[PDB]
Homo-oligomer: A and B are copies of this chain.
Amino acid sequence: EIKTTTTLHRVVEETTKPLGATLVVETDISRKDVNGLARGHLVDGIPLCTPSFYADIAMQVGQYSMQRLGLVDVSDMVVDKALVPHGKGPQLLRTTLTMEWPPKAAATTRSAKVKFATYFKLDTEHASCTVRFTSDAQLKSLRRSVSEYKTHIRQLHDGHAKGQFMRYNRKTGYKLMSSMARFNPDYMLLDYLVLNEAENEAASGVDFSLGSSEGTFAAHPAHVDAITQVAGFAMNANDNVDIEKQVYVNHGWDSFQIYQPLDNSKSYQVYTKMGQANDLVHGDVVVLDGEQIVAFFRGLTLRSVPRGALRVVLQT
List A residues at the B interface (Cβ < 8 Å).
160-163, 166-167, 169-172, 175-176, 178-179, 182, 237, 239-240, 242-244
Q: CA–CA, A162 to B179, complex, Å?
A: 30
Q: Give the nearest-CB partner of A168 in chain B.
A: B166
| Best-surrounded residue of A161, A163, A242 (most CB of chain B within 10 A) | A163
Interface pair B243/A169, CB less than 8 Å apart: no
Interface residue from B172, B179, B243 paired with A239 (Cβ < 8 Å):
B172
Q: Is the CB of A175 within 8 A of B172?
A: no
User: Please, which residues of chain B bring their CB within 8 A of the CB of A169?
Assistant: 239
> Once the chains are docked, how many angstroms separate the CA of A243 from the CA of B176?
11
Residue of B with least CB distance to A169: B239
This protein's copies in its complex: 2
Report 16 cross-chain contacts, Cβ distance below 8 Å, ordered by A residue.
Answer: A160-B163, A161-B162, A162-B162, A163-B163, A163-B167, A166-B166, A166-B167, A171-B240, A172-B176, A172-B239, A175-B242, A175-B243, A178-B178, A178-B179, A178-B243, A179-B179
Among A175, A179, A244, the most chain B Cβ lie within 10 Å of the Cβ of A175
Question: How long is the Cα–Cα vector from A53 to B211 in the complex, in angstroms?
Answer: 45
> What residues of chain B lie closer than 8 Å to A160, measured between beta carbons?
163
A171–B244 contact, CB under 8 A?
A: no
Q: Which of B161, B170, B171, B239 touches A163 (beta carbons < 8 Å)?
A: B161
User: Once the chains bind, are B163 and A244 in contact (CB under 8 Å)?
Assistant: no
- Known contacts A176-B172, A239-B169; A244 and B182 CB within 8 A of each other: yes
Q: Which residues of the other chain, B, contact A237 by a CB distance below 8 angstroms?
A: 172
**Considering only CB atoms, which chain B residue lies closest to A176 in the complex?**
B176
With the chains together, A240 CA to B169 CA distance in Å?
A: 10
Which residues of B have CB within 8 Å of A240? 171
Chain B neighbourhood of A243, CB < 8 A: 175, 178
Most interface-central of A162, A170, A179, A182 (chain B CB within 10 A): A179
Which B residue's beta carbon lies closest to that of A240? B171
